[PDB]
A paper describes a structure:
With the exception of plants and certain protozoa, where a second enzyme with broader substrate specificity can form UDP-Glc4567, UGP is the only enzyme capable of producing UDP-Glc from glucose-1-phosphate (Glc-1-P) and uridine triphosphate (UTP). The available crystal structures revealed eukaryotic UGPs to comprise a structurally conserved central catalytic domain with Rossmann-like α/β/α sandwich fold (reviewed in Kleczkowski et al.), flanked by a flexible N-terminal domain with low conservation at primary sequence level and regulatory function in S. cerevisiae, as well as a C-terminal β-helix domain171819.
We thereby resolved the UDP-Glc complexed conformation of the full-length hUGP isoform 1, which represents the first product-bound crystal structure of an octameric UGP, and thus enabled us to identify the binding mode of UDP-Glc and to discover an intermolecular mechanism - we termed it interlock - that stabilizes the sugar-binding region. The asymmetric unit of the crystal contained four hUGP1 molecules (chains A, B, C and D) which formed a non-crystallographic cyclic C4 tetramer. The bound UDP-Glc enabled the detailed analysis of the active site, which is located in a deep groove at the center of the catalytic domain (purple) and consists of a twisted eight-stranded β-sheet (white arrows) flanked by α-helices, a structural motif characteristic for nucleotide binding domains. Electron density analysis revealed the binding mode of the product UDP-Glc in the active site of hUGP1, where it is coordinated by the NB-loop, parts of the eight-stranded β-sheet and other residues of the catalytic domain. The phosphate groups of UDP-Glc are coordinated by the active site residues K127, H223 and N251. Compared to the apo-structure, the side chain of H223 is rotated by 90° in the UDP-Glc state and thus reaches a position which allows formation of an H-bond with the β-phosphate moiety. Movements of the N- and C-terminal domains toward the active site upon UDP-Glc binding (closing of the structure) resulted in a slightly more compact geometry with a deeper active site cleft. A more prominent rearrangement was observed in the SB-loop region, which undergoes a considerable tilt. R287 of the SB-loop of one subunit (A′, light green) forms H-bonds with D456 at the base of the C-terminal β-helix domain of the neighboring subunit (A, dark purple), to which it is connected side-by-side; likewise, R287 (A) interacts with D456 (A′).
Residue numbers in the entry:
A (entry chain A), D (entry chain C): 24 to 508
B (entry chain D), C (entry chain A): 404 to 508
């Protein structure tokens, strides 16, 4: 049966293929090839699961603390190591979570600087001070490729070599019937709902086919540093780099991932285990529902994955050449506005850590993991709680306590326009610890938020926090409207 | 008399020279402010009224520390409702109304 | 101190070995809870607070038996209103407001 | 230890005794004796004292279906068989639950008729139609005796001989001390603080000591019919009486209780079993630890006790003068005015069934089990749903379905006073199945309720149902004030 399914899907896929402008046909074919392999693997095994008996906690030498690395000290010549590195940023996504139409990378983060501006500023400044020439590679998506290339012109005078390569594009496949939903139409058909970016993970296949890893490996590059464009913490670290290109005892690590300690918040997943001799990234979906609670337990697994990864180009080429590169199949289900239940197969770049030799984890501070998922984060990042230089944000020296406060703005704030609208100015959050804003709320200028502030406005009601307002350990509720006279 | 609107020296009150215009502002505090005890308790400190013209406050109203009142301010808390003006709040030419409670934590 | 967050022996309290994170959570019950009689009255049983981090209870609130409070729970009931958190209720990172009354049938 | 403490308590009770009424002095001790016996007995058996093994379901013909008795059931002569019977009603209860002090019997149930009025009416009409002389007897309490004897002047001209006897009153006992609560203030400090009725068991002890037992057995009475005045259903059944005084094969039954099938509501009562060769009434309390959940199971035990009993006076005398009457000690606890925690010992009349020869239950229809405990039951009984004839209520023949409808009135309706005030007339409930009313609700004249009706007036809100309103399968909520003009 299964074979008949596969072959039945694929020749239909061949039919889809027949539709193509020649412009981007051959590049379409590959993607289909890629998908199909994913699909061949998809039905190779079902109910993807791991033998919990064979799992183990990683050895203490397999996940080293960042302070030891930093202890060792930065490298003797920064230039010669920076020239062996290439920065890669994931740009597959857009600001729909933040209620913006365009690619996320473009949403303004601080003082008219967008995420991309910040990355560019970083690497540029890096080059300018160390008189080196680091590249920036942006892994775009079909949703962002074009929207993104348009604005790359701004960085002509800024001192960095920005590249680009499009992620794959796979057909969404119906849930009940394991067939593709595509009507053999191109991107322009408004059938964009029938396609998807497989994974942050296919980057191996996408980066190989782009031919940039051969350019770069030929250009004398040893390592790529992958991160997200929204993760403001993912700076290029000279200590980690030093531990990479000047390895002690000659241990070349092909694949090293930054992990960090778990808060009760971020239990989400992405914790390293020792499975069958090598490190493996284990996700909750992989764990049986019998040991799912034990997996979340912070005694047994203290850390999780920040998708800040340093990988060796060489190993990528070697492994991709052999299709030995191995990642679990994420079968993601979705139901979109059209009213259609579909699944879409994908993979996570981290999961491949099990196919590389001498794979390593390093437990970096949370400082290196500041994802800006939503507008509440934006509020942190814009406030005097943080300080920006050379496109790099660091916590304020004037922050009395080292922790990052907690801030949850409601649905009224979800869209950036609304967020900006509702804050006359960004309030003083230097002494802040907890902040909960729920209903319809507005903030005048020079508000000051200290400690635990819970402003709550009920449904229908609205709260206008007057300017100059100092809220320190207050819980403020009701319905107040301030009007002009 | 208690505000920075007047300066006190050797018992003698004189309207602050800093006052832009020699006119004395109009202020009407509601029933909840009639008794000196309530009044005192309801103003955590005497606000900045140096740029005040009209102040009308009616109902259950509370002032935090350092409030600044400028020009025309009307604060109307209806029956049953209360209004807690947070501290440092500067109100300039505004009518503020509704039901807002500010509790400690 | 009454919750399973803590363990008592020989008149000595120590934090539960089962507390996943070493910190003590934060809990602020309102004025309705201030008096011990009221506090005891309003908690049918002491809820599970082993996974709790922040807890803010403000207005008139009651808790049935076997409520479970995890992470950040902000229950808020407005003036006049009342909230009856039903028994067995699991509140994890929720902010719950309004006016709900549960009555016997 | 236990005995040493018992005698210590006995001394105290003697210290109690030395104070008493000259005229009512002596019997107090008789009551008191009963008390110690109870104390001795309750310490004699500490714990479950009953296994789970020896219990078995009653065999068929342990309990006979009422339908089988009513078959060719009416006696050829109804006078003679009625002349041998005496009707006893349990009147040791107040209407505090319905928000009145007076004995519950004195609360007006239908058309100004009280429970008593109904009973008196019934047997009076019996006497008047069958030219017989049936006695009525009330088991009173120290809470109802005087109050009942005051109003018994009413039935002077009504053709029925009404008698009265007061059950024992025992001193409450402290939970920790195991000594009499004994505030003895003196009784000026009220009894509830000071004394209690043993619940239903005493009936045998006090009915003997009253001399009415000897009176009636000597007057020519063979059987005694016990039930509650609040159980409107418990009428004198001539069929049961016929199967009783004219038994087949001349097998006389000394004790017979009416049981009925368990609805979902009545799964909390005690049930009939066969234990150690004889029928016995078993209680939840009697079933400690394991096997508890099964007792409730309607699959195992399908019937429960209506407390509508028929007993032989001869048997009662024979067994009482031998002290062979055995009932399972029941221990209950609470306190309020005292600000104490207190224990009181009592027994159950139904439990004694085991100490009788030829004990025989019968499964009567719910028609005979209609306990009016709340105003919600009054509304039900006062409505056209039931028809009244000579103190006897019978469900309307117009009622399409035999089932009784569910009605629940709110806290505003608990007190009969408020309840009466809130209904300008009893609405039509003949096509009613389900009625729920909550909050400040009022009903005009000639309202008609059909099917399911839910009326919710939230806190602060009032709902005035306008008169003549017909509500059928509606849920009405809101806030409506109907005023006069
Ligand atoms: O197929 C995709 C989807 C998204 N992106 C880009 O990467 C981000 C997607 O990641 P995010 O939405 O930030 O969360 P996750 O996909 O879980 O991936 C990373 O970011 C999370 C932030 O919480 C971390 O928790 C995860 O460990 C980390 O792998 C977006 O900003 C996109 O620009 C891609 O390159 N390819
Ligand atoms: Zn193209
Ligand atoms: Zn925008
Ligand atoms: Zn204060
Ligand atoms: Zn029979
Ligand atoms: Zn009774
Ligand atoms: Zn009469
Ligand atoms: Zn009343």
């Amino acid at each position: 049966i299964r074979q008949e399914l596969e072959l039945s899907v694929k020749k239909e896929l061949e039919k889809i293929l027949t539709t193509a402008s020649s412009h981007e046909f051959e590049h379409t074919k590959k993607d289909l090839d890629g998908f199909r392999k994913l699909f061949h693997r998809f039905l190779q095994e079902k109910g993807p699961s791991v033998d919990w008996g064979k799992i183990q906690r990683p050895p203490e030498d397999s996940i080293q603390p960042y302070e030891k690395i930093k202890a060792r000290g930065l490298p003797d010549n920064i230039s010669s190591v920076l020239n062996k590195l290439v920065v890669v940023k994931l740009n597959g996504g857009l600001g729909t979570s933040m209620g913006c139409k365009g690619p996320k990378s473009l949403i303004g983060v601080r003082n008219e600087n967008t995420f991309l501006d910040l990355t560019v500023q970083q690497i540029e400044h890096l080059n300018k001070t160390y008189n080196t020439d680091v590249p920036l590679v942006l892994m775009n998506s079909f949703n962002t490729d074009e929207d993104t290339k348009k604005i790359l012109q701004k960085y002509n005078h800024c001192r960095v070599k920005i590249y680009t390569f499009n992620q794959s594009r796979y057909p969404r496949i119906n849930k009940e019937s394991l067939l593709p939903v595509a009507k053999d139409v191109s991107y322009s058909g408004e059938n964009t709902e029938a396609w998807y970016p497989p994974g942050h993970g296919d980057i191996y296949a996408s980066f190989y086919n782009s031919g940039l890893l051969d350019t770069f490996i030929g250009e004398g590059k040893e390592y790529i540093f992958v991160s997200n464009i929204d993760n403001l913490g993912a700076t290029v670290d000279l200590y980690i780099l030093n531990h990479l290109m000047n390895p002690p005892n000659g241990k070349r690590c092909e694949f090293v991932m930054e992990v960090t300690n778990k808060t009760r918040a971020d239990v989400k997943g992405g914790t390293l285990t020792q499975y069958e001799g090598k490190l493996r990234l284990v996700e909750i979906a992989q764990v049986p529902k019998a040991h799912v609670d034990e997996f979340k337990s912070v005694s047994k697994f203290k850390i999780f994955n920040t998708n800040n990864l340093w990988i060796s180009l060489a190993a990528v080429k070697r492994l991709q050449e052999q299709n030995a590169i191995d990642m679990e199949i994420i079968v993601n289900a979705k139901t979109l506005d059209g009213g259609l239940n579909v699944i879409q197969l994908e993979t996570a770049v981290g999961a491949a850590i099990k196919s590389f030799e001498n794979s390593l984890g390093i437990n970096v501070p949370r400082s290196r993991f500041l994802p800006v998922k939503t507008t509440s984060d934006l509020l942190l990042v814009m406030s005097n709680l943080y300080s920006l230089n050379a496109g790099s944000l660091t916590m304020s020296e004037k922050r009395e306590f080292p922790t990052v406060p907690l801030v949850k703005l409601g649905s009224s704030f979800t869209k950036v326009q609304d967020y900006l609208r509702r804050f006359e100015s960004i309030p003083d959050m230097l002494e802040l610890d907890h902040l909960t804003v729920s209903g319809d709320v507005t903030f005048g200028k020079n508000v000051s938020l200290k400690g635990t502030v819970i402003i709550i406005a009920n449904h229908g009601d609205r709260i206008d926090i007057p300017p100059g307002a100092v809220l320190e350990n207050k819980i403020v509720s009701g319905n107040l409207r301030i009007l002009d006279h």
